[PDB]
């Protein structure tokens, strides 16, 4: 069912995450972590304190799809587990140094063709697929986007709800 999902998405904030390769999204799904550039890291840390749920919606560049979405479970933290990200060009391991913990809500794909009817007021009402890494997505757009994803029956939202 979608009732627990809607409860998780209630009053959430949504951010578009653009990854330059598939390997880091695979790593994020396996290990429950994400790292981003310092400009976006500051935005997510601020949002994490401000909202019941902060939702990251992932898209690998050139894939024409979203690869799933997840909820922040912590602010960024340094040290510890040094994630072996596959670094793109012009990207250093110190730029991706802050590590957020994330709980996946959906690890299923959604093609961009399925979200063509959703526009993002915080990006000039362009289709929600369009946006830079870290672009915030307005509440109603982000909620409907997340509801378009196929259900992920491998995930039990019960423990996610407890962390709220
Ligand atoms: C684990 N974190 C990440 N992995 C990858 Cl492959 N790409 C990421 C981007 C997008 C981007 C924006 C500006 C410059 C560059 Cl080079 C890339 N943001 N976070 C990323």
Swiss-Prot record:
RNA binds at residues 18-20, 34-35, 85, 133. Changing residue 132 to F: Reduced binding affinity for N6-methyladenosine (m6A)-containing RNAs by 9-fold. It comes from the Eukaryota. Changing residue 34 to A: Abolishes binding to N6-methyladenosine (m6A)-containing RNAs. Abolishes binding to m6A-containing mRNAs. The keyword Cell cycle does not apply. Changing residue 44 to E: Does not affect ability to influence alternative splice site selection. It is found in: Nucleus; Nucleus speckle. Keywords: Isopeptide bond, mRNA processing, mRNA splicing, Nucleus, Phosphoprotein, RNA-binding, Ubl conjugation. Changing residue 66 to D: Abolishes RNA-binding and ability to influence alternative splice site selection. One of its GO terms (biological process) is mRNA export from nucleus. Changing residue 104 to D: Does not affect ability to influence alternative splice site selection. Changing residue 56 to E: Does not affect ability to influence alternative splice site selection. Residues 12-149 form the YTH domain. The keyword Phosphoprotein applies. Coiled coil: none annotated. Changing residue 132 to D: Does not affect ability to influence alternative splice site selection. Tyrosine phosphorylated. The modification Phosphoserine is found at residues 81, 92. Its main location: nucleus. One of its GO terms (cellular component) is nuclear speck. The YTH domain mediates RNA-binding. Interacts with SRSF1. Interacts with SRSF2. Interacts with SRSF3. Interacts with SRSF7. Interacts with SRSF10. Interacts with CPSF6. Interacts with KHDRBS1/SAM68. Interacts with TRA2B. Interacts with KHDRBS3. Interacts with EMD. Interacts with RBMX. Interacts with ZCCHC8. This is YTH domain-containing protein 1. The lineage of its organism: Eukaryota, Metazoa, Chordata, Craniata, Vertebrata. The chain holds residues 345 to 507 of 727 of the full protein.
